[PDB]
GROMACS .gro file of C-alpha atoms in nm:
model
  157
    1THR     CA    1  -1.114   1.008   0.618
    2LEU     CA    2  -0.804   0.988   0.461
    3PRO     CA    3  -0.695   1.182   0.147
    4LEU     CA    4  -0.516   0.901  -0.099
    5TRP     CA    5  -0.154   1.020  -0.110
    6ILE     CA    6  -0.026   1.151  -0.456
    7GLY     CA    7   0.326   1.223  -0.497
    8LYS     CA    8   0.505   1.360  -0.780
    9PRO     CA    9   0.754   1.170  -0.978
   10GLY     CA   10   1.075   1.110  -0.732
   11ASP     CA   11   0.883   1.146  -0.429
   12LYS     CA   12   0.914   0.832  -0.195
   13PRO     CA   13   0.590   0.756  -0.021
   14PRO     CA   14   0.613   0.994   0.267
   15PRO     CA   15   0.656   0.837   0.670
   16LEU     CA   16   0.277   0.777   0.768
   17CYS     CA   17   0.140   0.737   0.442
   18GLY     CA   18  -0.024   0.354   0.458
   19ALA     CA   19   0.193   0.128   0.596
   20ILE     CA   20   0.582   0.410   0.576
   21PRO     CA   21   0.664   0.418   0.933
   22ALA     CA   22   0.723   0.744   1.121
   23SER     CA   23   1.072   0.871   1.140
   24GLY     CA   24   1.260   0.795   1.485
   25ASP     CA   25   1.213   1.143   1.614
   26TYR     CA   26   0.847   1.146   1.512
   27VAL     CA   27   0.635   1.348   1.737
   28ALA     CA   28   0.248   1.365   1.675
   29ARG     CA   29   0.103   1.686   1.723
   30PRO     CA   30  -0.261   1.777   1.955
   31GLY     CA   31  -0.540   1.695   1.817
   32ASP     CA   32  -0.353   1.403   1.622
   33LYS     CA   33  -0.504   1.071   1.671
   34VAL     CA   34  -0.294   0.756   1.758
   35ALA     CA   35  -0.254   0.411   1.895
   36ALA     CA   36  -0.187   0.408   2.283
   37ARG     CA   37  -0.108   0.133   2.494
   38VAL     CA   38  -0.231   0.150   2.787
   39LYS     CA   39  -0.245   0.011   3.170
   40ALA     CA   40  -0.630  -0.216   3.128
   41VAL     CA   41  -0.794  -0.441   3.385
   42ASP     CA   42  -0.323  -0.630   3.079
   43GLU     CA   43  -0.177  -0.429   2.821
   44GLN     CA   44  -0.433  -0.258   2.575
   45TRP     CA   45  -0.381  -0.027   2.272
   46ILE     CA   46  -0.605   0.206   2.245
   47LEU     CA   47  -0.708   0.444   2.026
   48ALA     CA   48  -0.629   0.790   2.179
   49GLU     CA   49  -0.614   1.169   2.084
   50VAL     CA   50  -0.283   1.319   2.133
   51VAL     CA   51  -0.296   1.680   2.394
   52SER     CA   52   0.057   1.747   2.415
   53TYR     CA   53   0.433   1.642   2.418
   54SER     CA   54   0.693   1.681   2.649
   55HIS     CA   55   1.071   1.694   2.492
   56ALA     CA   56   1.196   1.677   2.899
   57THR     CA   57   1.056   1.352   2.946
   58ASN     CA   58   0.981   1.197   2.574
   59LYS     CA   59   0.580   1.125   2.736
   60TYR     CA   60   0.274   1.222   2.578
   61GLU     CA   61  -0.083   1.344   2.766
   62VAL     CA   62  -0.334   1.145   2.568
   63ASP     CA   63  -0.712   1.119   2.542
   64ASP     CA   64  -0.896   0.811   2.531
   65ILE     CA   65  -1.163   0.942   2.343
   66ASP     CA   66  -1.484   0.775   2.406
   67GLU     CA   67  -1.896   0.863   2.392
   68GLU     CA   68  -1.873   0.932   2.778
   69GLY     CA   69  -1.600   1.164   2.806
   70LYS     CA   70  -1.202   1.107   2.783
   71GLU     CA   71  -0.954   0.976   3.015
   72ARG     CA   72  -0.614   1.107   3.040
   73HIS     CA   73  -0.284   0.907   2.995
   74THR     CA   74   0.034   0.967   3.030
   75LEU     CA   75   0.257   0.774   2.809
   76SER     CA   76   0.647   0.732   2.669
   77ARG     CA   77   0.676   0.805   2.352
   78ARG     CA   78   0.749   0.449   2.252
   79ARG     CA   79   0.370   0.295   2.367
   80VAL     CA   80   0.211   0.567   2.067
   81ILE     CA   81   0.179   0.475   1.736
   82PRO     CA   82   0.076   0.775   1.478
   83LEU     CA   83  -0.179   0.679   1.285
   84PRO     CA   84  -0.140   0.707   0.911
   85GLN     CA   85  -0.208   1.076   0.780
   86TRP     CA   86  -0.264   0.963   0.425
   87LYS     CA   87  -0.378   0.599   0.225
   88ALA     CA   88  -0.180   0.432   0.023
   89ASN     CA   89  -0.272   0.395  -0.282
   90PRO     CA   90  -0.325   0.067  -0.416
   91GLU     CA   91  -0.304   0.147  -0.756
   92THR     CA   92  -0.025   0.365  -0.729
   93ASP     CA   93   0.193   0.312  -0.445
   94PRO     CA   94   0.127  -0.074  -0.355
   95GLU     CA   95   0.415  -0.123  -0.182
   96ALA     CA   96   0.310   0.088   0.100
   97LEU     CA   97   0.020  -0.102   0.231
   98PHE     CA   98   0.074  -0.395   0.399
   99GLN     CA   99   0.086  -0.730   0.250
  100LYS     CA  100  -0.105  -1.069   0.319
  101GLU     CA  101  -0.006  -1.260   0.639
  102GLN     CA  102   0.176  -0.971   0.802
  103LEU     CA  103   0.148  -0.890   1.173
  104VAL     CA  104  -0.050  -0.589   1.251
  105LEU     CA  105  -0.268  -0.414   1.541
  106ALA     CA  106  -0.609  -0.285   1.418
  107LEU     CA  107  -0.897  -0.167   1.511
  108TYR     CA  108  -1.171  -0.401   1.633
  109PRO     CA  109  -1.532  -0.317   1.442
  110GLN     CA  110  -1.718  -0.084   1.660
  111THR     CA  111  -1.459  -0.038   1.885
  112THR     CA  112  -1.181   0.205   1.995
  113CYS     CA  113  -0.931  -0.064   2.061
  114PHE     CA  114  -0.649  -0.239   1.869
  115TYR     CA  115  -0.562  -0.574   1.827
  116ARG     CA  116  -0.303  -0.808   1.664
  117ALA     CA  117  -0.429  -0.930   1.354
  118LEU     CA  118  -0.294  -1.091   0.999
  119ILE     CA  119  -0.371  -0.927   0.626
  120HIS     CA  120  -0.648  -1.114   0.497
  121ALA     CA  121  -0.654  -0.915   0.131
  122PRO     CA  122  -0.521  -0.541   0.103
  123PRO     CA  123  -0.694  -0.311  -0.068
  124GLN     CA  124  -0.698  -0.362  -0.422
  125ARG     CA  125  -0.864  -0.046  -0.492
  126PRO     CA  126  -0.830   0.327  -0.401
  127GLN     CA  127  -1.151   0.348  -0.176
  128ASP     CA  128  -1.127  -0.024  -0.033
  129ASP     CA  129  -1.053  -0.122   0.307
  130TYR     CA  130  -0.771  -0.410   0.440
  131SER     CA  131  -0.959  -0.745   0.489
  132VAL     CA  132  -0.799  -0.874   0.828
  133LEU     CA  133  -0.832  -1.201   1.051
  134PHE     CA  134  -0.773  -1.080   1.407
  135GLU     CA  135  -0.606  -1.299   1.696
  136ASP     CA  136  -0.951  -1.468   1.874
  137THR     CA  137  -0.898  -1.746   2.102
  138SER     CA  138  -1.271  -1.766   2.109
  139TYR     CA  139  -1.194  -2.020   1.825
  140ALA     CA  140  -1.020  -2.319   1.771
  141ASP     CA  141  -0.763  -2.237   1.523
  142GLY     CA  142  -0.753  -1.881   1.661
  143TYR     CA  143  -0.862  -1.615   1.417
  144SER     CA  144  -1.178  -1.431   1.375
  145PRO     CA  145  -1.319  -1.429   1.006
  146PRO     CA  146  -1.184  -1.183   0.759
  147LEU     CA  147  -1.338  -0.836   0.883
  148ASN     CA  148  -1.260  -0.463   0.703
  149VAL     CA  149  -1.038  -0.221   0.872
  150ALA     CA  150  -0.957   0.095   0.709
  151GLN     CA  151  -0.602   0.210   0.610
  152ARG     CA  152  -0.643   0.486   0.872
  153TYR     CA  153  -0.668   0.211   1.164
  154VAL     CA  154  -0.403  -0.025   1.064
  155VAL     CA  155  -0.067   0.034   1.197
  156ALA     CA  156   0.239  -0.184   1.250
  157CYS     CA  157   0.252  -0.422   1.553
   0.00000   0.00000   0.00000
């Protein structure tokens, strides 16, 4: 589960704290969890684990983490979003949270998949989840009711 970022005086919330994006040259480590855009049946963002990165090809190897075993994908860095490594504390670094109505990618409850959603409510207290409205064409107005997603599993779209 993710630690709260606790910065000292004059420290910016860092890359991968809450909504602060990774640096443009960033490379994730083996074992890091990421959102990975893979071909589906269509394309789909999935929860995945980094196996390696090659600087020669700018491609990761990632494993889809499923309860029956893992399936390997090889992906450009452009299809891999590192998850946050710290929660932003709403009480100290509120500006590092996604705000109401922002478009994000969020892990759908009880899945290992990410989908487009709008922020319904950011966390108000350090232990809180986001509340989001997932895009869902099964409903007339096209949105789920508010569903909880932890800071770990909400990334920029």
